[PDB]
């Protein structure tokens, strides 16, 4: 085994925003999901298509790990066939998903008494999101029939809004770090898997 990074995605000092979310293409070693079951209690462990118990023995061509921070009540939105603010505008999951979703609370690390406004998410967009494709933009979203020429104001809003996490928030409004694992196969010979 070469220990291709799983202790880096979960132990990163700084995560990404909802509309950014870092995508890591991990297929380089023998998978060691034993550490996944450890590292604090999990608010959710909802592997789809594959039983969580019988991981650690299955040959996967390419693993995709996506990480971002959201609030608690939106954690249930990271699932196939779900409609919501995060699903329709920030992060979309296909209906034929084969992977896992792991969420854990991060009030101690990702919250400040004054407020953490470094985390952003999109709220308004002309059209919805196709599965697994990003959109980073700052153009003013036209809400009427008068072009604003890139100037905020009436019927012309900025698409990104900040969270503002504070330690005294409730469970549903607390920061939650989410790692989603996506699996797929290709015609290339399988080499990235255990003995």
């Amino acid at each position: 085994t070469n220990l291709c990074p799983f202790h880096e995605v979960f132990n990163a000092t700084t995560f990404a925003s909802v509309y950014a979310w870092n995508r890591k293409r991990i297929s380089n070693c023998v998978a060691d999901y034993s550490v996944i079951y450890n590292f604090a209690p999990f608010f959710a462990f909802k592997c789809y298509g594959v039983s969580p118990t019988k991981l650690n023995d299955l040959c996967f061509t390419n693993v995709y790990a996506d990480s971002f921070v959201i609030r608690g009540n939106e954690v249930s939105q990271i699932a196939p066939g779900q409609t919501g603010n995060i699903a329709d505008y920030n992060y979309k999951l296909p209906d034929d998903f084969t992977g896992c979703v792991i969420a854990w609370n991060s009030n101690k690390l990702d919250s400040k008494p004054s407020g953490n406004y470094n985390y952003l998410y999109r709220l308004f967009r002309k059209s919805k999101l196709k599965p697994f494709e990003r959109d980073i933009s700052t153009e003013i979203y036209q809400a009427g029939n008068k072009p604003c020429n890139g100037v905020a104001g009436p019927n012309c809003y900025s698409p990104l809004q900040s969270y503002g996490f504070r330690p005294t928030y409730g469970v549903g409004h607390q920061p939650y770090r989410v790692v989603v694992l996506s699996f797929e196969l290709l015609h290339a010979p399988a080499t990235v898997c255990g003995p």
Partner: antibody
């Protein structure tokens, strides 16, 4: 292959029981075990899950209240129940899980045992 | 959780007839659904996995057909050793597998 349950009886509310399931005819070190309860009307309901490497899974209902553990010395699976309520009255079965690839299922269930509260 | 519903609530037939029971899901589940038999006085037994595959041991008279959301289980010829309750359960979402309410097959 056979699975035999034990631990049935009556308990006052707030009590604790230690139900056991003994499996024979196969290797306990490979397959994974599940506890599934059945009530009249509501139907079957999954209660607990234990796998090969020290992992335990529970529903939202029975969370922070059940402590499923197994010992491979004599091929026995244990389930400890505390702070029992009136809704835990059911018949409990211990089942074995297996998959022919990506598709998972429960192979054998056994006989089952009865639990009631008053 | 993914709810599961079954139809019809009850079914009555004689020996040799063909009986079909349908199972409906709330979300798309692909081919992740399995079939169980609940002969009274005993424990449920596996009949069909992968929503189409025939488990080793069960007679071939049972057939599971479906893809997507709505599935069907059909017994071509009914026999007296079939009075039981049949359940459809999901495997797409783990480890919170959920069962159906079961069906009544009264032999008469």
């Amino acid at each position: 292959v056979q699975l035999v349950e034990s631990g049935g009886g009556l308990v006052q509310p707030g009590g604790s029981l230690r139900l056991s399931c003994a499996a024979s005819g196969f290797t306990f070190s490979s397959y994974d075990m599940h506890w599934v309860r059945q009530t009249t009307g509501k139907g079957l309901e999954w209660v607990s899950t234990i796998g090969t490497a020290g992992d335990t899974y529970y529903p939202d209902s029975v969370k922070g209240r059940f402590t499923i553990s197994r010992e491979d010395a004599k091929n026995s699976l244990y389930l400890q129940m505390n702070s029992l309520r009136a809704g835990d009255t059911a018949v409990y079965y211990c089942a074995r899980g297996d998959s022919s690839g990506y598709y998972y299922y429960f192979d054998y269930w056994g006989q089952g045992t009865l639990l009631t509260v008053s | 959780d993914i709810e599961m519903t079954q139809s019809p609530s009850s079914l009555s037939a004689a020996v040799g007839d063909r009986v079909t029971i349908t199972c409906r899901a709330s979300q798309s589940i692909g081919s992740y659904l399995n079939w169980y038999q609940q002969k009274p006085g005993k424990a449920p037994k596996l009949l069909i996995y992968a929503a189409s595959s025939l488990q080793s041991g069960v007679p071939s008279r049972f057939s599971g057909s479906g893809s997507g959301t709505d599935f069907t289980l059909t017994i071509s010829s009914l026999q007296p050793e079939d009075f039981a309750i049949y359940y459809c359960q999901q495997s797409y979402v783990s480890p919170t597998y959920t069962f159906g309410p079961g069906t009544k097959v009264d032999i008469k």
